[PDB]
Amino acid sequence: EAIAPGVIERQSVDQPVQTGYKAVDSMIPIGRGQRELIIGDRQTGKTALAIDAIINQRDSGIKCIYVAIGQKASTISNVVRKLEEHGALANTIVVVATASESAALQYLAPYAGCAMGEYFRDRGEDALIIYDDLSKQAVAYRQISLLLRRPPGREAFPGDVFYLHSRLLERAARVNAEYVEAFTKGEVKGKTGSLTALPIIETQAGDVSAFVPTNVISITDGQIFLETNLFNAGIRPAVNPGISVSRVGGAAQTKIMKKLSGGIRTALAQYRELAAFSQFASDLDDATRKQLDHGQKVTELLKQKQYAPMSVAQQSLVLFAAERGYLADVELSKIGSFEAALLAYVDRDHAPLMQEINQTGGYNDEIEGKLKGILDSFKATQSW
């Protein structure tokens, strides 16, 4: 139990944290030091989306921590076996309090995980911590609180159920170099540490307006809202645009990604709502028609398979192909093939340009031209 760094010791979140997924890396960027709630209903892919972010730091120097509260032991063993299957386990700490353990271990686990992450934060390094269910921590705390005869509040949760998550998530912070110097007695100069948190919350029947879900939405710096209607429709990751935001906005994106992405997310939100009325009929029916076709191909492009991360270079050139036309002709049936070919071709030929965009934010009219050239070359001479 410790108190987070004060207001003067923070620093604005600048650097990016790359997950493997086009959807969140484009619409919902995460920066080092941010706190980003992953919220949704049961069996919509939360744990998947989180351990896919853990696996992606395998090589970016960000230590990672994964705490599982109230989970089944089989699930934890399986997740550890996957973390070992992709080499990430040598870089992650796993703090586990299974569904069978006392309510005092479940309730105290995420504080142990945050204490293990603050070790890296305070030494000028970077870390990433995932609370597997801060909905089950709330339930275990409700148990411990009711067993002491403490007057409950709404939904029988105690009064301080907000403070419980507040004093926890307020530790995931980014600290300026003076804090790192003073803390480490001057052993570390000029570096800035950070601890990035991805708490996971479970909501009943997609009800984004219960008590605990709303508390954590009011504590974190954004939310990725995974909707079950999309998940059942084969759209995965089922990121629901229009309800998911990143309150640190584009400041946390690479220059190239910030440029290509733009208002893409509100564009998909508009498309998805338009689909509600266009379901029956529509007028202005050529501009709304091209709008619909573009948005539809984009959603068909944002879905992605599990355990398949793609560097900022690949996401970037795929978003390039998405935004500079280059996809109208290819059918909804081929989007997949377009991407597979495109990425194989660029891996074959323009390995240097990928090596460059991956090393930098990498945006310029020079690089825009290089990308346009690759795009027309693949588009014409390659047949996919």
Partner: protein
Amino acid sequence: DLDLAKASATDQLKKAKAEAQVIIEQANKRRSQILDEAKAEAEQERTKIVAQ
């Protein structure tokens, strides 16, 4: 008119007969590329399995 229809006939078959093969050749080319990727990846994942 008999002269013209014969000329058009010959030319149209000229286009169609060859273009069938040029499209089939594009098909075969992409087949070859896709199989190159397939074999390369089916080999490359052996590395992951052995390290596991």
